[PDB]
């Protein structure tokens, strides 16, 4: 695999061009934000159905031929004031004139207004039922113009202000368009609730995590930039494919928390790079190379968890998937570009401004408890979660209704009043759409055939008990082509819960010869959508689990840890969905959170499965990979677990808290779908950030310490060669496999190995042949140069340990800093290095910063600054990082002291 090849280059590059990166990407994000403000006028409310289904075809054909039903666009209940009754002919006259005026003013929007009030002397019984028995309320129907849902809704919102002022305001609007206006306005209301309640809370959590103003501010800015760029991208996407309303809040509910968490992790990694003594440029490079990789892998995991949603046919789920993908990918891009560039500019200045600026280890021991006795905690945790799965099996599913809004919502209440006062009018029948393959008309006899065949099916509502009084032809209006080759008949259902059966029965009827039959109606559309979701759930789950487990094996290098992860994520998923059913189907929580218990939107369960699985996988890989890394750390115990939970404890709690703040803003949504999604997010977050991270996954995983890392893998993951003193000096003194003359004109070879000060080259050839034990012809191989160099360092170390000024400082140093001191000795002699009494003593006392600052003041640094700066930063950090990423190549080769023979 390709660990750290491209990320090192990018880490050099962002420091190299921090200014234009921070300019270009900020320009892009702000331009995208401006462009994406227009999103909201280019979003759709459609997307809940299966557009390949037979119900949708029945809808398309029936609307084309009979005209779309616009009778439920807008119902308006009028109550005459001052206890006057609908038969008051003066009140009648004035409201007629008002309605006619608004219609005349809005003929681009209103087809007309229809009702009993238009013919109060009529004898039509259905029209007569448009007034109450007490003569105190009468409703009218106001069909609107337009040829998709969104255009109709916009027309309604255009005419609604003037329509509410009719009858002195004593008019109550209901039907599909007032409800759709309310349901789609919930989006913006949730937006501003997040703006006012979550941004300050994220600010306090950020400042608590960091402690200084700038460090806390950077992730907030990164999140804002991500929000803006992602809204821009979604608008651009809207130019080509339709984008559902619900896609806007998802950008900020899911995306904003992820953006900020990425930012915060990068910033804390940068700060700990600084605290370890690294250059700002080295810091930037190493944070992108370490934490940028895991940020990007998190992005890959979230995208991998989201893309299986694209199997489902609902445009709703597709728009949400696009939004998730756009948000998280931009968040990763921003975190390793804008943020890295900013940090490259600031350097250590990120900690400058402290708490006072006014203008307007606990982990480790808790895990040792679970560790020393695990099963006593694993078992009850593992059974409470299954008895939270038990409510799952009951789940109810249904379509959109007035009850998606809160009970105290005025529009929902106008709908409920209309249904209480005029019960017969709101119907959702099943349609039989008959289409002739040939274009010739359908005869009356063929309709009689289909009519009888339909009569063979039970469970269909029958108002009047008459064979012919059933399955009436659908009404035709002016918008319909009236094509004779297709005719529709319809009838309502007896039991609303008997639809799926009845539809199937209606689909099993052998239709007449030469015709094709599509059965539609709202129950048909809803049930077909549900069938599509239930039918694609297996493949979606399979791809989800297989992709995530493969990613997790890449991350873990084990075949048991990803399987454990998969099943614990499935387990918290089942548990959290059980809780959700407990709250939103059975209602435990309904009174406090102000929502109506009801079935759930069917695409919501696919959305929530993908979302919860993704979150579980993300948090679990972040927690577990730093326990599996403990082999770079070399500690073989199951103590990997304790250090991995302790190293990532504060970080996980901060990230979880920030996302929890954002989702807690959204649990208060007037839209029960949004409530259910935000709540699922919150429940999964608290389940994975506490009960699974802190208690379970130490427990079940101590059941297998050494049996879990790379348990059974043949060839698995290559370990990079550790750097050494040979490579260090090969950089500093060159490695030459043929004799050459150094700056002083002397015959040198290998790594700074003087052969002789003789002018005779063949004297050097003789000496090199003597040293190597063969006639070399003045050429050696790299391994021979390596052995010659090892002999030179053995001589150097002998000399160091015999020197009273160097032996103490040398003995007190680790292997890397010892190699730095030996480097100094090679370059300048024991005596030379021994002149650094102050510096050497600071090194002996592990005062790395003081020693580095003092050594930088030397004439050694002045005459050979690049080599000296490499050695000095090696003394600082105690690592090989200054050599694993150094400046150019050397040009002046000088043989070192302590050349051995
Ligand atoms: C942010 C969340 C917002 C959620 C709020 C949405 C709740 C209100 C929904 C309004 C739906 C109006 O439904 C009434 C219409 O239903 C069908 O047609 C609809 O379904 C067909 C097949 O899909 C499409 O071809 C038609 O274009 C499409 O109008 C009927 O054929 C139309 O005669 C009837 O007028
Ligand atoms: C989730 C949201 C759910 C929303 C549920 C709301 C459902 C509302 C459905 C209301 C439909 C009632 O309107 C039906 C009216 O239309 C037409 O009028 C005609 O009546 C007489 C001749 O029949 C004359 O007065 C006119 O010349 C003529 O126009 C029809 O011929 C009648 O059947 C009926 O009068
Ligand atoms: C960061 C993530 C960004 C992801 C962005 C993905 C945007 C997808 C662009 C197009 C929608 C993809 O889905 C396929 C879509 O094609 C349709 O229209 C098309 O109808 C014919 C069918 O072949 C074409 O020939 C037309 O050219 C074409 O307009 C509609 O658009 C969607 O109802 C439908 O699903
Ligand atoms: C459907 C989605 C379509 C996208 C295309 C699929 C591409 C699949 C992989 C993409 C490569 C992106 O980088 C993935 C890299 O990240 C991982 O992180 C781990 O090493 C990081 C560096 O320290 C830290 O994250 C943690 O150590 C630890 O998590 C590892 O480095 C490697 O597994 C991999 O090299
Ligand atoms: C876990 C870490 C922290 C998690 C939480 C983070 C902060 C989230 C809370 C921010 C505001 C809290 O609620 C404020 C909301 O409630 C009131 O209205 C409604 O309150 C209930 C339904 O919302 C019902 O009483 C009524 O429908 C109606 O009165 C306000 O008027 C709304 O404008 C505001 O939206
Ligand atoms: O917090 C979500 N990851 C966390 C994982 C922990 C981080 C990993 C990188 C270093 C800092 C910690 C970042 C944030 C998260 C995942 C997720 C998902 F897959 C779907 C979804 F809808 C919401 C999600 N949130
Ligand atoms: N680190 C050094 O170069 C020490 N030098 C420089 C100094 O500290 O003044 C003095 C000494 O010879 O002890
Ligand atoms: N030739 C170089 O760039 C390095 N120079 C010295 C330096 O400036 O670091 C020679 C040496 O390593 O002693």
Swiss-Prot record:
Outcome of mutating residue 324 to T: Binds to SQ109, AU1235, ICA38 and rimonabant with a dissociation constant (Kd) values similar to wild-type
Membrane topology of the entry: Multi-pass membrane protein
Record flagged with keyword Aminoacyl-tRNA synthetase: no
Consequence of substituting residue 661 to G: Binds to ICA38 with a dissociation constant (Kd) value similar to wild-type
Biased composition (Basic and acidic residues): 466-485
Site location (Part of the proton-transportation channel): 261-262, 618-619
The keyword Repeat appears for this protein: no
Cytoplasmic side: 6-19, 267-295, 562-564, 625-651
Consequence recorded when altering residue 298 to A: Growth defect in both liquid and solid media; confers resistance to SQ109 and AU1235 with 4-fold and 33-fold increased resistance, respectively; disrupted membrane potential; no significant difference in cell wall hydrophobicity; more sensitive to ampicillin and the hydrophobic antibiotics, rifampicin and erythromycin, but no change in sensitivity to chloramphenicol or kanamycin, compared to wild-type
Chain segments annotated as transmembrane: 20-40, 202-222, 223-243, 246-266, 296-316, 323-343, 375-395, 541-561, 565-585, 604-624, 652-672, 677-697
Periplasmic compartment spans: 41-201, 244-245, 317-322, 396-540, 586-603, 673-676
Regulation (activators, inhibitors): Inhibited by the antimycobacterial compound BM212, a pyrrole derivative. Inhibited by the antitubercular drug SQ109. Inhibited by the adamantyl urea derivative AU1235, the indole carboxamide ICA38 and rimonabant, the antagonist for the cannabinoid receptor CB1. The dissociation constant (Kd) values for SQ109, AU1235, ICA38 and rimonabant are 1.65 uM, 0.29, 0.16 and 29.5, respectively. Inhibitory effects are due to binding of the inhibitors at the proton-transportation channel most likely dissipating the transmembrane electrochemical proton gradient needed for substrate translocation.
Effect seen on changing residue 306 to A: Binds to SQ109, AU1235, ICA38 and rimonabant with a dissociation constant (Kd) values similar to wild-type
Consequence the record notes for mutating residue 202 to M: Increases resistance to BM212 with 4-fold increase in minimal inhibitory concentration (MIC) to BM212 in liquid and solid media
Positions bearing the site annotation: Part of the proton transportation network: 564, 620
Consequence the record notes for mutating residue 569 to I: Confers resistance to ICA38
Biotechnology: This protein is a target of small molecules which can be validated by developed assays that measure the topology of trehalose monomycolate (TMM) in the inner membrane of mycobacterial spheroplasts after which they may be developed to future antituberculosis drugs. Designing improved inhibitors against this protein could be achieved by avoiding direct contacts with the identified residues that can mutate to confer drug resistance.
Keywords recorded for this protein, A-Z: Cell inner membrane, Cell membrane, Cell wall biogenesis/degradation, Lipid transport, Membrane, Transmembrane, Transmembrane helix, Transport
Subunit structure, as described in the record: Monomer. Interacts with TtfA (via N-terminus); active trehalose monomycolate (TMM) biosynthesis is not required for the complex formation. Interacts with MSMEG_5308.
Something else known: Binds antitubercular compounds N-(4,4-dimethylcyclohexyl)-4,6-difluoro-1H-indole-2-carboxamide (NITD-349) and 1-((2,3-dihydrobenzo[b][1,4]dioxin-6-yl) methyl)-6',7'-dihydrospiro[piperidine-4,4'-thieno[3,2-c]pyran] (SPIRO) with Kd values of 0.05 uM and 0.8 uM, respectively.
Protein name: Trehalose monomycolate exporter MmpL3
Gene symbol of the encoding locus: mmpL3
